[model samples]
Target: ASGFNAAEDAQTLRKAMKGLGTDEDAIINVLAYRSTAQRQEIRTAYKTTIGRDLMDDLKSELSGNFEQVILGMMTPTVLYDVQEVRKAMKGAGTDEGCLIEILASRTPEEIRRINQTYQLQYGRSLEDDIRSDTSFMFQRVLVSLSAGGRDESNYLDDALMRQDAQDLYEAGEKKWGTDEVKFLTVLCSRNRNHLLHVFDEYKRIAQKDIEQSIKSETSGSFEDALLAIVKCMRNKSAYFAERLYKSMKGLGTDDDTLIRVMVSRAEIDMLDIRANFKRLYGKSLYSFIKGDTSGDYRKVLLILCGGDD
Candidate 1:
């Protein structure tokens, strides 16, 4: 039984959650609007004193949307635990519906934060483990997706665009060979918003999508890597749409792509993207993923799509 104080509300709520027969509502209410860092402190305090895991307790007590919202309040470390569980379960031949729902739909920034927290708490890299677990085309795509990191775009300048486009042209097409550093700098350094505009300008100037240019002019793993970046940049929705399309295009659903998108996006921006996907394709992305994918992967993807279920 913990008493709430204005100064240390998080601590108080954490203590409450840790106690036997804890008040679930109290912990949820207190954490509802708290920042990730604040919730993290509460988590730490809850574990240290009560010797109980807040996440486990919450998972047991909550269900549906309420559970999802509460889980969203947890520290990235706890969130990764949820992710790892999903991944491992899916690997163990379980459905892993929830895992696919959250992972693929998260923003680059959210994924980056998760990666950071995974390393901090587990003392191992999320990418490394994922690589060890998966293989072939899926492995290649996941490693590339994970390695691309997140793009937190900011403001940009007109001159910067010209310089970037010029650099891209010169590096990939202007000469007999390409300059990898120039290409990387132009791709990785620019703000996303700016790069979006820059891509349009590049298309206008070069009369080609950047991916086409790269594919036509470049070769090797670097080419593949650059092409992935261009594909992601050209239109993330289209990129995701293509991934979804490919997943179901053949005999079996590409479980890897299905899992990656679903697990990655559950908390980040799946809601926004689902809306975009529907608008772009004239059908629900959720329904499509569900129709194409099966079992746990489908279930999780549907959840990540944030439908009324």
Candidate 2:
């Protein structure tokens, strides 16, 4: 009842767990709201006092998602746990649970941040390892999800739009031959928000969506991949809105896209995108994700989709 302090509360929780043995509830309640620093203190105190780690005891006592949440909370090492899970699933044997929970539930930006942190902590790129290890559609999804870089909040103006649009047209459409560097440079570097307006301006001027223009004007897989990027950039929500519509558009679900969106947006501001989906389609994103996806992936996605209230 005396508010939790990292050191003192850890000692208290350790005593409750170790001495009583049956006091899991007490341990859980005491430690539940503690910060990562607090949890570390508790673990240290529990080990020093009991000669065994607090997590070992808790692992024995707790089960299922409850255990996962507690374990996830116990360390400043959330990224470590994420890395470990990814490593475990990267090869021939995939841990669908880890894939669903971590991949499907985290936003592209969150994944990018995690990759940056992971690189700082481990001295290697998370994206490089994921690319080397996974293959096919799974690899494609993971790589795209891991390329979590998004535009920072910045203002845009007509001059920027005209410049970007003209650049895009010249590089991809206006030239006798495409300028790949100019095309990618503008596509990847433009502020996402600014690009959104540029795409609208592009349609007004060119009388075609960016995707259609690219498809008609460009060739090869680079064209296809770049087109996907343009479409995602044009309106991520509408991209996802179409993804949801396709999922339930016919009998049976488009499970792959459904899973991809739910998992990718789980933490990445999917809520904003979801709002976009609802506004575009006149239906709730949650209803769409719920209707199409199921099992543990669905459960974790739903929990994550609820967002931070």
Candidate 3:
């Protein structure tokens, strides 16, 4: 949309953060408008030319959710995923929703990179933490996803998919007790296109949506994981649209989830998310975000929102 100059932008950012009052507008104008590659260039320029870490400067200058958006904007996507996952499992109680949202939606390649980075950054494996922190079927699901071992090929087998669906039906809908492994094995390991077919077959066999079956059969984190896998496979942007709505709809916002979804998807699928938000909620994301948040937090988020639907 405009010419990008990383060195010059870095200078402007330094000026913004250097003064008595932070020039948040200037900072947002640079980071929110530029591409991620361009932002990294600016980060390098800030360090090489300014002789200080751009991230450090931004961290010192900004605060609250506003700071989170800015930091999330600057970090690379995989690294950010690693950071979020770590945060979700970091202390006392785990943020299982956050864990499921990231682990379930990412590509295998992305997940592998996350596993590598998680180990590099935290000095411990993601699976180890997940195993210790979460329990039972939920732990198993996260472990499977975190393994980065999901089938990613375009190849699909119709009979296999149907069998998988039937197995799922036997596991949950048709069974006395839900065999969570049967559901997880098929849902977590199959490619999305194949799973879509399985879902179709499942509807035929079970006479109910797979989502409904999961809801009826399971509860707690296990159900949440199953539902997340199903929703992500169907329409990722729509899944995220629901997440964003849930984040903002209540008495108080889930700023962690709100920031994670907005910042992570801003460059990836924000337009689709915005469109889905409008389609799902009958109002623009811009209007909702503007009403839900205030000041520079709202300002940068709106910039990332790109435009009104």
**Whose TM-score is higher: candidate 1's or candidate 2's?**
1
TM-scores, each model vs. reference: 0.53, 0.51, 0.95
Q: Least accurate stretch of 10 residues (summed lDDT) in model 3? A: 172-181
lDDT of each: 0.56, 0.57, 0.84
Compared with the true structure, what per-residue lDDT tens digits does model 1 show for residues 160-277? 7877776777775643144445666566556677776778777877888776787787665445444555655655555565556556567865555444445444455566556666
Per-residue lDDT of model 3, residues 225-282, tens digit only: 7789888888889988899998999897778898989899888888998888888999
Model 1, poorest ten-residue lDDT window? 93-102
For model 1, the stretches where C-alpha displacement exceeds 4 angstroms are 1-118, 122-153, 174-177, 219-225, 231-235, 275-283, 293-300, 307-309
**Residue-level lDDT for 109 in candidate 2:** 62
Ranking by TM-score: 3, 1, 2
Return the top candidate by TM-score.
Answer: 3
- The collision pairs in model 3 are none
Query: Residue 298 error for model 1, in Å?
Result: 3.9
